[PDB]
Design a protein around this ligand. Structure first.
Ligand SMILES: Cc1cc(Cn2nc(C)ccc2=O)on1
Ligand SMILES: Cc1cc(Cn2nc(C)ccc2=O)on1
Ligand SMILES: [Cl-]
Ligand SMILES: [Cl-]
Ligand SMILES: [Zn+2]
Ligand SMILES: [Zn+2]
Length: 570
């Protein structure tokens, strides 16, 4: 308690000593309140919207651009649950460690990241790019760092909104734990369940490979507030990664887990406006990228245990017998790798193809670990999927699509209203017409690469790339091959043919017309506006929309991509 968070509390209390009140009308029950002191909406991308006019009248698209569970308490698991988690976690860190070496990340790696611009989620210095160059920052980092070796913390404080800390705390986190992401610990090759750095063009092939295994249905249960259900027991099993570490690193990592993860401190703005200095031990509070890795780890653990319960490796979560402990360990050593290979896990998101459908009603460990399923009753058995093409994963489903030459594409898909609505939204303001156009172009090239099989998206993508100057540059499961000025057909051939391990025949495709679409009926099912008069007017009069946007941007060098499509080929 206060002996670990006090210093951080004391430092803040003094920076606002003038205005400090211990409010008695504070809304926190499960969060500890210490005191109080006085104290970037969604915009529309006009380039994308002018080139998607039929969607101006679709409420699912237009509503997307308009516009308390953290204060809950998860009970401590039973002793038999806690045992199962401890044994599985120890075995899983060993497996992940077999072919990887934990190691500290470096400023010269962190710096380069800030130069490339990433969601480091950091709050004297204007931007992050500036602070990185000023050694005064690195001096502050040194003081804190040397404090962490002391077993103490001063400035590592969360700001609720998404939990931003200041760039310095983010570095000390990245220094100790960045290896997890930087060195691909949750790669499919390394972790067997993971998909880190796979890409949306590989996920469908991965789910089809799981489907090939003998077993029951495919289960894809979402957790209700995954992060809020992260117990102190989960934070302590995650910390066992430090047992694979040495020297300074082991100390630095131990400090992040002890002082920032297992004993947090947060400043939340309450408009009644008084900045509450609230604390708590449990729930998920980290950088988005370390959160991804530890979420994947803990999810892999929970799902192996749910598989154990379904296969009758253990009878009761209340207590584990000495013989059961040996049986769990023997199960992991004998079949652990096989059972990891039956799953696709991305943070809190999973798909499991268990040995059989006993898994569907194996609920006691899952519920007692506090990973309560969403959109169902706690003890109602899971609904599985019989077809890998119906399974939801990372907000997508996957279609099997046969090319006119017999080669097989497995393509990602979601409701087209969600795709068009997202492309019409920008995260921030103050951007130029040029920067808005380059973001439109990023969406267009993503659509050409991932969603080429949707008739409306291939047409709108061609229209946007025709409307934006040819040479202008586009601006954690994913890898982003669409962020380039290279020709999109060349990138398509690299991604879907050359580099695709599921494609035996490497014959390049010579034109976009060789590249197939979904069934005309399969397109409407996933939200296409084909067979509507509106969409017909838009398609026919596409060159007029392209010319409207060219006139707004001005006299630049443009390319006509519309003749890459059959209907505009004269
Ligand atoms: C993805 C993503 C990035 C942004 C923020 N943004 N918005 C504009 C208008 C221009 C550039 C830019 O980066 O919005 N969505
Ligand atoms: C079902 C179904 C059949 C069609 C006919 N049609 N097909 C296309 C590809 C474009 C426009 C068009 O009217 O559209 N939806
Ligand atoms: Cl199904
Ligand atoms: Cl994007
Ligand atoms: Zn600290
Ligand atoms: Zn679909």
């Amino acid at each position: 308690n206060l002996d670990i968070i006090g210093k951080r509390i004391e430092k803040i209390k003094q920076e606002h000593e003038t205005s400090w009140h211990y409010d008695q009308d504070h809304p926190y029950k499960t969060w500890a309140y210490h005191g109080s002191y006085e104290t970037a909406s969604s915009m529309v991308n006009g380039v994308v919207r002018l080139l998607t006019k039929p969607w101006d009248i679709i409420p699912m698209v237009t509503q997307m651009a308009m516009t308390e569970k953290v204060d809950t308490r998860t009970q401590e698991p039973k002793e038999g649950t806690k045992k199962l988690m401890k044994i599985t976690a120890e075995w899983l860190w060993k497996e992940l460690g077999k072919k990887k070496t934990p190691r500290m990340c470096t400023r010269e790696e962190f710096t380069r990241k800030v130069r490339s611009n990433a969601a480091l989620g950091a709050i004297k210095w204007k931007s992050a790019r500036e602070a990185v160059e000023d050694s005064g920052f690195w001096e502050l980092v040194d003081k804190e760092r040397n404090l962490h070796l002391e077993g103490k913390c001063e400035t590592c404080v969360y700001n609720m909104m998404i939990w931003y800390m200041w760039l310095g705390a983010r570095f000390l986190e990245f220094e100790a734990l960045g290896f997890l992401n930087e060195d691909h610990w949750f790669s499919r090759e390394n972790s067997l369940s993971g998909v880190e750095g796979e890409g949306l063009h590989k996920l469908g092939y991965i789910l089809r490979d799981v489907s090939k295994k003998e077993g029951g249905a495919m289960y894809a249960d979402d957790t209700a507030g995954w992060d809020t259900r992260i117990t102190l027991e989960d934070l302590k099993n995650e910390e066992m990664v430090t047992n694979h570490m040495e020297g300074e690193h082991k100390k630095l990592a131990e400090a992040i887990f002890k002082l920032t993860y297992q004993n947090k401190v947060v400043r939340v703005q309450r408009p009644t406006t008084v900045m509450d200095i609230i604390s708590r031990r449990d729930q998920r509070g980290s950088g988005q990228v370390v959160t991804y890795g530890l979420n994947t780890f803990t999810n892999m653990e929970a799902q192996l245990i749910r598989q154990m319960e379904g296969e009758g490796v253990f009878k009761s979560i209340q207590h584990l017998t000495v013989t059961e402990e040996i049986a769990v360990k023997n199960w992991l050593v004998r079949v652990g790798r096989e059972r990891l290979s039956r799953m696709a896990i991305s943070g809190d998101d999973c798909v499991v193809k268990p040995l059989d459908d006993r898994f569907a009603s194996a609920l006691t460990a899952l519920n007692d670990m506090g990973k309560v399923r969403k959109d169902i009753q706690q003890w109602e058995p899971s609904r599985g999927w019989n077809d890998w093409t119906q399974v939801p994963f990372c907000s997508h489903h996957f279609h099997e699509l046969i090319m006119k030459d017999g080669r097989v594409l497995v393509v990602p898909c979601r409701n087209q209203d969600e795709l068009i609505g997202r492309a019409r939204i920008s995260q921030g303001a103050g951007w130029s017409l040029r920067e808005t156009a380059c973001l439109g172009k990023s969406y267009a090239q993503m659509w050409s690469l991932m969603y080429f099989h949707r008739r409306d998206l291939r047409l709108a993508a061609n229209a946007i790339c025709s409307a934006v100057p040819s040479h202008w540059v586009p601006t954690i499961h994913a890898t982003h091959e669409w962020m380039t000025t290279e020709d999109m057909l060349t990138v398509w051939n690299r991604v879907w043919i050359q580099e695709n391990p599921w494609m035996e025949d490497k014959t390049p495709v010579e034109s976009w017309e060789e590249i197939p679409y979904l069934g005309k009926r399969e397109d409407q099912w996933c939200g296409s506006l084909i067979g509507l008069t509106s969409r017909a007017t838009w398609a026919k009069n596409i060159q007029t929309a392209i010319n409207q946007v060219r006139s707004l941007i001005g006299n630049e060098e443009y390319t006509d991509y519309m003749p890459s499509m059959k209907r505009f080929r004269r």
